[PDB]
Design a protein around this ligand. Structure first.
Ligand SMILES: COc1ccc(NC(=S)NCCCn2ccnc2)cc1OC
Ligand SMILES: [Cl-]
Ligand SMILES: [Zn+2]
Length: 303
């Protein structure tokens, strides 16, 4: 299962001390909390709430001068039948040649009679991405015009409607990876960074994929550097995990040799797919720290 990551993959934080200090002190706690609050509502595909959450994501980023495409399509799910799914694709430069993609799923799992909020899964991850664009507004402006740019991708229909299987999960990612495959729009992904199950306490991360192990070690180094500077209020292990075959929105991209960085803890939060994955499970020290590490990774990668 676990192997120590070899030195060849170490990839220390590169930002200059003044820039690392400057950027690591950018935050917006209130906005992060407000974004969480707006998304932390039952949001099953096809519900009014599902549309409201899409609108909030869409308008938040449009107001930050991002280009936002909504990829709408129909597909049949068990129980529900014909559903209208809506992936959200936000770019700072819509005419960039290449992208770092940060992603999370915005739907919540259909759990009859239970108003499942999916706080970690993935209300908090989506919020971290809105918060990232909000916090780093100034520093990301250059990426509106550059060849390498940033994409925030919000997947729809990640969750199963009946029982998690290859045909009853990741509805939006399966459609989009297929669509981009056909349109020749997958090679442009430097890597797809997928945030999932974040916001609960004591997350442990591991590198899942050897072609991105090096950029995992850049996040690990960001975390180390922040610890040393007293900027955190450890998560990333210097170990990789093989034959874990965790299924999520990345799979249809992974299958087609898009490099994945899967930011999902192992073990999953204890409250996973229970009603306790709600407002009360969110650890806001952990959430602030993770959001920061991810914001700095993004800046490390993109400059
Ligand atoms: C009990 O913890 C686990 C449960 C299942 C699996 N195996 C798979 S294939 N999970 C697919 C995850 C889909 N998903 C992610 C977020 N919302 C839904 C691994 C677990 O711990 C490693
Ligand atoms: Cl509703
Ligand atoms: Zn889930």
């Amino acid at each position: 299962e676990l192997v120590d990551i070899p030195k060849i993959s170490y990839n220390p934080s590169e930002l200059s001390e003044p820039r690392f200090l400057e950027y690591s002190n950018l935050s917006d706690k209130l906005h992060l909390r407000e974004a969480i609050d707006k998304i932390l509502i039952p949001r099953v595909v096809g519900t009014t709430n599902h549309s409201i959450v899409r609108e909030y994501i869409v308008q938040s980023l449009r107001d930050l001068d991002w280009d936002v495409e909504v990829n709408s399509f129909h597909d049949h799910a068990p129980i529900k039948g014909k559903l209208h799914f809506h992936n959200i694709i936000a770019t700072l430069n819509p005419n960039a040649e290449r992208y770092l993609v940060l992603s999370a799923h915005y739907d919540s799992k259909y759990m009859p009679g239970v108003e499942f909020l999916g706080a970690t899964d993935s209300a908090v991850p989506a919020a971290m991405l809105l918060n990232l664009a909000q916090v780093l507004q100034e520093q990301l402006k250059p990426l509106k015009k550059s060849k390498l740019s940033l994409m925030l991708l919000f997947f729809d229909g990640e969750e199963a409607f009946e029982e998690w299987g290859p045909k009853d999960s990741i509805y939006g990612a399966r459609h989009l990876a297929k669509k981009w495959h056909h349109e020749g729009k997958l090679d442009r992904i430097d890597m797809l960074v997928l945030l999932d199950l974040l916001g609960a306490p004591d997350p442990a991360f591991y590198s899942f994929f050897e072609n991105t192990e090096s950029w995992y070690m850049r996040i690990q180094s960001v975390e180390t550097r922040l610890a040393k500077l007293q900027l955190l209020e450890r998560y990333f292990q210097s170990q990789a995990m093989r034959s874990s075959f965790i299924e999520d929105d990345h799979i249809p991209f992974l299958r087609r040799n898009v490099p994945i960085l899967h930011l999902i803890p192992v073990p999953f939060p204890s409250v996973w797919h229970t009603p306790d994955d709600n407002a009360s499970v969110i650890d806001y020290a952990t959430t602030d720290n993770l959001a920061l590490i991810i914001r700095l990774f993004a800046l490390e990668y993109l400059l």
